[PDB]
Design a protein around this nucleic acid. Structure first.
Lengths: 140, 99, 74, 74, 38, 200
RNA sequence: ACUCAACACGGGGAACUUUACCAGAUCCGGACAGGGUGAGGAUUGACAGAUUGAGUGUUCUUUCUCGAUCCCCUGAAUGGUGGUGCAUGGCCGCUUUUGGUCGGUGGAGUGAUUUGUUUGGUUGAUUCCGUCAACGGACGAGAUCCAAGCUGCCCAGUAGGAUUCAGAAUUGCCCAUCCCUUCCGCGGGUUUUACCCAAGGGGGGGCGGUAUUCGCUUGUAUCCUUCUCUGCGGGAUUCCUUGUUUUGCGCAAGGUGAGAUUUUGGGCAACAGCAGGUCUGUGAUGCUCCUCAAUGUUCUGGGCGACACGCGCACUACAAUGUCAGUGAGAACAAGAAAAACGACUCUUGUCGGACCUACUUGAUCAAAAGAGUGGGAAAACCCCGGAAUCACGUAGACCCACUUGGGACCGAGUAUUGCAAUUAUUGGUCGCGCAACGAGGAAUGUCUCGUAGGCGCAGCUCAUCAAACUGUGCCGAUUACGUCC
């Protein structure tokens, strides 16, 4: 492993591959974007970036944790049931992305459902995160 | 492969008479003896209302069992295992295994 | 806090029959108590031990409520 | 591993300073260790203490430590 | 469900850990090896 | 396993209850069982071992047969033995049965209980207690105590030393309760919580 | 059941079952033939027809199948969630969470009674020391036990680390970690001081001689028991302050120390009792009620216990938001505990796998709910045995002082899942209504002093199916007081 948490994985490993991936297309954009991504919304899926805060991160989780997928990988999914029926709030996940995200890894920086690196492209291209921000970073 | 002996019992001082004492017979005498330290001891906890009616202070109990699982290991006895498992007869729920 | 009459009784008897016990050290007096006694409690043996120290520390003044065989000489 | 984020950070500090101390024990004289250690002890963690105050059991017929259900009149 | 040491089916059936001893209460009907110490 | 221990509990329960009812006033203490590998000894603790066996031998094989027909056991996997318990005094349940017999014969409560007390406290017991609640009047539900020697109810340790028996007597007007305790002079933990001794 | 020892209580989250109760039918359980019918009987079983909600074979007709048990009359009987808990056994609650209780011998009194069990001090304590017409005793208390904190010994193949071999991978110079630190010497910029610049010697490694992390690269080598685990043992009411202590019983602060006193948290508990509760826990029961158009009883059907003038009370939960704060995203990270086996198939000279979970992949060339196949486990194996809430976050997110984008409760339409049967049972789901309440809420009143209160989540429990409940584990974690008796 190598990916995530070596550059600050929370907010300084995300925006940089995001820019690069939208600038030249790579990952899935399949219809289903509008549909509920996180439990019991009263709003739309998000204000902007419906399924473009997702894809590399959903590779990252499975990478460093070795073959967490489809039921384990929603482990680092979310759901609080933040609106509820006046009972004690409980955790959930929405399966929608699981299918698409186990498809993903066969292209771009990972190989297979057993081996999750190639040259580990994301790491190498993320070495310029530290050097210079692309967001006007506070710490750079 | 290597044969192991797990002895599962409700009570201590039944299993004790098995492991310590009657493994001496298999210690280097016919096979070699690798002692680890026995597996974690489960509790079976049950909670029972004391009162047989709806008027009390709504009291309850805590009842517990110990489950002693005593594991000691040997290095491949075959046909010798017959001796090993015929040794304890000293309490009920003494059960032994052979791989 | 306050100790029971079992404690004080046993410890008084000990200090009468033994002057092997003579110390203000908890540790020594404990090890000679426990081997000479059958009481089958940690608590009682530690109590009794500390009481025997307390006795001897008071005997440094002179007056005690304890029992000793010293009366022979006095 | 074994508790939430906050308690892990506490545990971190402890194991770090422990490691420094033990290193300077084995490979280096007691003098250097005494210097280091005394200043650790001083500066409010303590170092030595595991802070080993854990938890409460839940009991009866009752929820946590007492606030009961809520009263019947008396 | 239903019970096998009564036929009452009411006054509550334990089926925890595959036993019934609450259609005949376990305080009265002990010697199952359980004890209370805490 | 989890289930082993529970099922052993079940077996003991059923067994113990069957005997303690239908075989009684023999000085029945109880039963004890242990395995000898694909056979179970199942010794039967009685003061009088002759009734257990039978003088026609019918009793012992009846009791084997009942167990077999219930649990699908066969011969050579199941056996029943007798054991001679000396001093009926030191068995709670046994004294309980003899007392029950006195009362069903319509003998005086006082006289009856005094028999038990005499017997027990002769063999060197620390204490005994006979608490007979129930009818003796009407119109009360009167409770009579008889307390002898000394007895402890402190700790959880007491439970091991002191064995207890509760039984019923069934008479005209209805039920009479009976209870017997008896603190043994001999520990079953080999432990005391009082008297620090000094070895001289 | 009804102040407390009623009122999310009767392990009671009940729809058919459970079931007392209601709407109807049935059985023999009325067994026991002692007084009668054997063949062909009042009968056992039965297609059609009828009976009736029930083509149901109870019944009645038809015709068939018949043991003679079923059936006839008495006596006898058994069964019951029926009453009586003021007939009763056992059990539980409370009195009572305090320190209380009883006998022998002796003393005193006509006796009922008293002394022991008592002025003082100390303690949670009838806990102690002292004193006395009491003396010597027994219980409760203490202690013995259970769990927690620190530790020795045991100690390794499902517990987890150490080094090298190993290759993936990185070897960060695109905005900073070749450049420093320490010691020392000399020359400059300073009038002096402070401050600072240059060069060299010695010394230490730093980015590469220390390089990461993989909880599977499960690869290839080597070694160990710090981290783990369970059984059995260590560890103070000692020392000191020379304070307080008239000597005693002891008290306070500080110290050693993992831990300062009933070590800490629980569990058990005397005597006297209550007309407490329980006869719907029982094969624990007195009597007398139900004992056949039985009400008992039914894998019988359906209904009730749950109803709604907007009525009172008890308990619970959700909010009125800026101190998760409201809709979005991403990161790091937890602990007890649950689980499996059907005489059902197959297997043989004496017999194996299906009703538990979780893994993985299709379920997205197009939703959720939800379909199915492969794979392992009887559990320290279940894929890392353990994860997403409280929390963290400036990613330069969105909302922004409003009954809203804060909250849900009503209400309509659709669909799948569960089941012997659903009648919002289903509900982890879509998407309407929200602009329906409610803005910390009169009087009154509850309970806790520490890892507690408060906040938060998970599992077990019950079981066709549902947990705002109950039980247990874990996480975040204070303010005030440490006093008095009003």
């Amino acid at each position: 492993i190598r990916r995530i948490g070596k550059k600050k994985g929370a907010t300084m490993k995300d925006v940089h591959p995001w820019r690069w991936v939208k600038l030249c297309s790579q990952h899935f954009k399949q219809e289903g974007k509008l549909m509920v991504p996180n439990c019991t919304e009263i709003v739309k899926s998000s204000h902007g970036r419906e399924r473009a805060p997702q894809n590399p991160d959903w590779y990252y989780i499975r990478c460093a944790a070795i073959l967490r997928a489809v039921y384990m990988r929603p482990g680092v999914g979310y759901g609080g049931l933040s609106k509820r029926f006046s009972n004690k709030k409980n955790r959930g996940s929405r399966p929608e992305i699981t299918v698409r995200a186990s498809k993903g890894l066969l292209h771009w920086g990972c190989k297979s459902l057993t081996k999750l690196g190639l040259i580990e492209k994301c790491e190498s291209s993320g070495h310029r995160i530290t050097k210079n921000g692309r967001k006007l970073a506070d710490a750079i | 492969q290597r044969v192991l002996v797990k002895m599962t019992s409700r009570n201590a001082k039944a299993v004790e008479n098995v492991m310590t004492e009657l493994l001496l017979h298999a210690r280097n005498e016919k096979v070699v003896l690798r002692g680890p330290v026995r597996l974690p001891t489960r509790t079976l906890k049950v909670t029972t209302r004391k009162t047989p009616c709806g008027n009390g202070t709504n009291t309850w109990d805590t009842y517990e069992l110990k489950i002693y699982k005593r594991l000691v290991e040997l290095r491949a006895p075959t046909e010798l295992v017959k001796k090993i498992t015929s040794f304890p007869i000293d309490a009920g729920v003494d059960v032994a295994i052979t791989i | 806090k306050i100790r029971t009459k079992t404690v004080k009784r046993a410890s008084k008897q000990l200090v009468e029959k033994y002057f092997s016990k003579l110390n203000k050290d908890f540790y020594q007096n404990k090890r000679v108590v426990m081997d000479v006694t059958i009481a089958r409690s940690k608590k009682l043996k530690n109590k009794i031990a500390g009481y025997t120290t307390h006795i001897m520390k008071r005997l440094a003044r002179g007056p005690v409520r304890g029992i000793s065989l010293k009366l022979q000489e006095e | 591993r074994g508790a939430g984020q906050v308690a892990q950070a506490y545990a971190t500090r402890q194991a770090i300073a422990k490691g420094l101390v033990a290193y300077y024990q084995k490979y280096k004289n007691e003098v250097e260790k005494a210097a280091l250690k005394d200043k650790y002890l001083a500066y409010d963690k303590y170092l030595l203490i595991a802070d080993p105050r854990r938890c409460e059991p839940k009991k009866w017929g009752r929820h946590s430590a007492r606030t009961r259900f809520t009263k019947s009149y008396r | 469900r239903h019970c096998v040491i009564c036929s009452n089916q009411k006054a509550v059936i334990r089926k925890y850990e595959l036993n019934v001893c609450r259609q005949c209460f376990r305080e009265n009907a002990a010697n199952i090896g359980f004890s209370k110490l805490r | 396993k989890k289930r082993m221990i529970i099922r052993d509990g079940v077996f003991y329960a059923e067994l113990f209850e069957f005997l303690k009812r239908e075989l009684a006033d023999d000085g029945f203490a109880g039963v004890e069982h242990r395995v000898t590998s694909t056979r179970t000894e199942i010794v039967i603790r009685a003061t009088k071992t002759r009734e257990v066996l039978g003088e026609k031998g019918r009793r012992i094989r009846e009791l084997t047969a009942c167990l077999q027909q219930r649990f699908h056991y066969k011969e050579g996997k199941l056996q029943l033995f007798a054991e001679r318990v000396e001093v009926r005094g030191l068995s709670a349940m046994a004294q309980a049965e003899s007392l029950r017999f006195k009362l069903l014969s319509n003998l005086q409560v006082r006289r009856a209980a005094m028999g038990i007390i005499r017997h027990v406290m002769e063999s060197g017991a620390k204490g005994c207690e006979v608490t007979v609640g129930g009818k003796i009047k009407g119109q009360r539900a009167k409770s009579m105590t008889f307390r002898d020697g000394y007895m402890i109810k402190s700790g959880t340790a007491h439970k091991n030393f002191v064995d207890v028996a509760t039984r019923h007597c069934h008479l005209r007007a209805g039920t009479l309760g009976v209870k017997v305790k008896i603190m043994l002079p001999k520990s079953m933990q080999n432990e005391e919580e009082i008297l620090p001794d000094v070895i001289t």
